[PDB]
């Protein structure tokens, strides 16, 4: 058998995000290419056309490995260091509006669902889908 | 370091670890001075010959790679090759010469 745990992290992400863009069901907010994704950032995402799908794949993988997550925890994960000009650096959380829509978009296509005890959990169909991409990723070598 | 050895495996063809050893042994000074004022010439122990070799090599690379177009590995690899040869082009060899000729005058 094969699991998502059996594949290199960035290798899996690149494979799945490219596939997900071809499916076309993943729906974009449309304000994309304006938002910085974090108040700590400078300049927007450089891969202007593709970056939304690649983030969507990352979220799915991260939830797959864990019991459940919520929007607050994701904002922490994708945070970073803000320069504060002449002052010392500090940790700052990333944009919420992005990540909440990603969860809702992934739910529309049935990969993920709202869970008791709050937050979201992987669907059995999510498992079934992500495992199949993993098997292709190994065999495509 | 990993990138540095690879480069030396292509510029020249020897087992590059041997080239490192040659550079070290050829660089370490064998005579020096101390202040008395004036300076008096003195011999230097084999251990310190090794320490001086390593210090001079990295400094010669570091100051070449500042405001560079060549990466660290590109410059460090060249120092090692130049020092395995008798090549006075290298910074570390230039430094060795002055220490010994100064010491000669004061002995």
């Amino acid at each position: 058998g094969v699991s998502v745990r059996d594949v290199a992290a960035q290798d899996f992400i690149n494979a799945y995000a490219s596939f997900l863009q071809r499916q076309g069901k993943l729906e974009v907010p449309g304000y994309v290419d304006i938002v910085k994704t974090s108040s700590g950032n400078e300049m927007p995402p450089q891969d202007a056309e593709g970056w939304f799908y690649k983030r969507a794949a990352s979220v799915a993988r991260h939830i797959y490995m864990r019991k459940q997550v919520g929007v607050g925890k994701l904002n922490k994960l994708y945070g970073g260091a803000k320069s504060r000009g002449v002052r010392p650096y500090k940790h700052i959380d990333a944009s919420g509006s992005i990540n909440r829509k990603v969860l809702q978009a992934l739910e529309k296509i049935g990969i993920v669902e709202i869970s008791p005890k709050g937050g979201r959990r992987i669907s059995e169909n999510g498992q079934r889908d992500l495992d199949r991409i993993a098997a292709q990723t190994l065999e495509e070598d | 370091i990993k990138h540095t050895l690879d480069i030396i495996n292509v510029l020249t063809d020897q087992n590059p670890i041997q080239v490192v050893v040659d550079a070290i042994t050829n660089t370490g000074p064998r005579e020096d001075t101390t202040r008395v004022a004036r300076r008096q010439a003195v011999d230097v122990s084999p251990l310190r010959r090794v320490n001086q070799a390593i210090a001079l090599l990295t400094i010669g690379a570091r100051e070449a790679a500042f405001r560079n177009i060549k990466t660290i590995a590109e410059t460090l690899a060249e120092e090692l090759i130049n020092a395995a040869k008798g090549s006075s082009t290298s910074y570390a060899i230039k430094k060795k010469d002055e220490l010994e000729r100064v010491a000669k005058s004061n002995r």
């Binding site: 290419d33 304006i34 927007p44 202007a48 | -």
Partner: protein, 122 residues
Amino acid sequence: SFQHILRLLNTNVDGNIKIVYALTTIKGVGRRYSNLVCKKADVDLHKRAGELTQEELERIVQIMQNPTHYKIPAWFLNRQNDITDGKDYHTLANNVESKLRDDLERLKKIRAHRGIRHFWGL
């Protein structure tokens, strides 16, 4: 074909630089404003400025000075809710430091602290 220097809005721009960065020679055109304008013009961001043809420098010039028609979110603009007329504007070229170097003089005329302190320092 390739042009090494070009002139627009009475500013000179050299062709040898990425188009997004080259435009920031113009007063008022910051990096983010420059970046978003190019996207709406759908020029190739990776082209160097000397590659573009006249009909492609136009449209860009047009969008810079009429930004609200292209549904730029207004909060992107540097002159929101103007004091005389509640319209929003973006200020460009020599028109920058003509509204600046005026609002302070308007404060001088009203004998406000900040105007006095500025001109007293001079």
